[PDB]
Design a protein around this ligand. Structure first.
Ligand SMILES: [Ca+2]
Ligand SMILES: [Cl-]
Length: 323
C-alpha cells in the first residue's frame, strides 16, 4: 500500500482534512483463552473492565514500575490488540512474552493490517461517506469487516483506522485531492498538542507511568489486582512520591530535540539542563512544539530552550488537569 510522503504538519485548529499513514506506530496482538487474565497481570489498566467498544492508553511496566512502553489497547478477536511506537514494539513484545511459557495465549506483531489516521476540518463528515457507522464519545470503537475505528476527542476530533490493505487503498482513492496526505509526524504533532505521551526507544525503561500523566488519562487502575510493577505504580500515587509530570512547550528552535534529549531552563543569566524530551515537531506556522517530562512544579513563566539555542520555548497549559 505504501507510506505517504511527509509534508509540514499543522496545529489541530488550522488542520485541513487530512489522511495519514501511521508508519511510525505498530500493531501487536494477543489471542487465546487466557488473553484477558494474561494481560491483566502485565498492564496498568483493568482489562476485565474494558468493553468491546472501548480503547485506552495503558502502561506495560517492569517490576520496578518503569514503562517498557505505553500502549493503546482494544479488544480484537478473543483477545486484544494494541498500538505503540514501532521503535519499541520488538523489545516490548519480548518483555511481554517472558511470562507466557505455559499460558493459553499467542502474542505476536501484526504487520499485515495498516494503521491510518483521519483528522482535521470535517473529518467526521468526510468519513461518514465511507463507513456505515463511525465511533463517537458514546461508542469509542466501531468495527466493520476488516476495519476497526477508534475515536479520539483530543486535541480535536480524529479517528484511528486499523484495516486491511484493500480498505486503505479504497480510502486513499476516495479521499485523494480532498484530504491532504501526510505521515506519522502529523499524528505525532496532535499527540504532543493533546498531552498524550509518546515513548520511543530512548525513553523505554525510563519513566514510571505518572511521570507521563497516565493516571490523568484513564490508563491506571489503583483498585485492580496484581500486575507487574503495581507496587511501584501505587507508591508513586502517595503524597509527594512522584516529582515528575509531562508538559507541552511551544516556541522556536534551530533544530528539534531528539527523544531522550534534555532541554535547558533559564535561571538568572545561566541555563540549566532540565527534563527529558519525549517528542518534538516543527509546525507549518513556525513553532516548534515539544512534549517533555520534568519536575511537576515548574513555574508557569519558566523559559526553556533547545540546548544552546538563540530562541526559546514556553509552557502551553496542558489541556487536562492533574488534580
Ligand atoms: Ca497548509
Ligand atoms: Cl520516573
Amino acid at each position: 500500500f505504501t507510506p505517504f510522503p511527509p509534508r509540514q504538519p499543522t496545529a489541530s485548529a488550522r488542520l485541513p482534512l487530512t489522511l495519514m499513514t501511521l508508519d511510525d506506530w505498530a500493531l501487536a496482538t494477543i489471542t487465546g483463552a487466557d488473553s484477558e487474565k494474561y494481560m491483566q497481570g502485565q498492564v496498568t489498566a483493568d482489562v476485565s473492565q474494558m468493553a468491546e467498544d472501548q480503547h485506552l492508553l495503558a502502561a506495560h511496566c517492569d517490576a520496578k514500575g518503569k514503562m517498557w512502553s505505553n500502549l493503546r489497547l482494544f479488544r480484537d478477536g478473543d483477545g486484544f490488540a494494541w498500538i505503540e511506537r514501532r521503535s519499541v514494539r520488538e523489545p516490548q513484545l519480548t518483555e511481554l512474552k517472558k511470562y507466557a511459557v505455559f499460558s493459553k495465549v499467542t502474542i505476536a506483531p501484526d504487520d499485515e493490517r495498516v494503521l491510518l489516521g483521519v483528522a482535521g476540518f470535517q473529518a467526521r463528515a468526510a468519513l461518514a461517506n465511507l463507513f456505515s457507522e463511525l465511533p463517537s464519545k458514546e461508542k469509542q470503537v466501531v468495527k466493520e469487516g476488516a476495519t476497526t475505528l477508534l475515536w479520539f476527542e483530543h486535541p480535536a476530533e480524529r479517528f484511528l483506522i486499523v484495516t486491511d490493505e484493500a480498505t486503505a487503498n479504497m480510502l486513499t482513492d476516495k479521499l485523494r485531492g480532498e484530504a491532504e496526505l501526510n505521515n506519522s509526524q502529523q499524528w505525532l504533532a496532535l499527540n504532543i498538542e493533546a498531552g498524550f505521551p509518546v515513548i520511543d526507544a530512548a525513553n523505554s525503561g525510563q519513566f514510571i507511568p505518572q511521570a507521563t500523566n497516565l493516571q490523568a488519562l484513564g490508563g491506571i487502575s489503583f483498585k485492580k489486582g496484581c500486575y507487574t510493577g503495581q507496587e511501584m505504580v501505587a507508591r508513586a500515587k502517595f503524597r509527594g512520591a512522584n516529582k515528575r509530570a509531562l508538559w507541552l512547550l511551544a516556541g522556536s528552535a534551530s533544530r528539534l530535540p531528539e527523544a531522550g534529549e534534555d532541554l535547558e531552563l533559564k535561571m538568572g543569566e545561566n541555563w540549566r539542563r532540565t527534563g527529558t524530551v519525549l517528542a518534538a515537531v516543527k509546525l507549518e506556522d513556525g513553532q516548534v512544539v515539544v512534549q517533555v517530562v520534568m519536575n511537576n512544579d515548574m513555574e508557569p513563566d519558566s523559559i526553556f530552550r533547545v540546548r544552546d539555542d538563540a530562541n526559546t520555548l514556553h509552557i502551553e497549559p496542558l489541556p487536562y488537569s492533574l488534580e
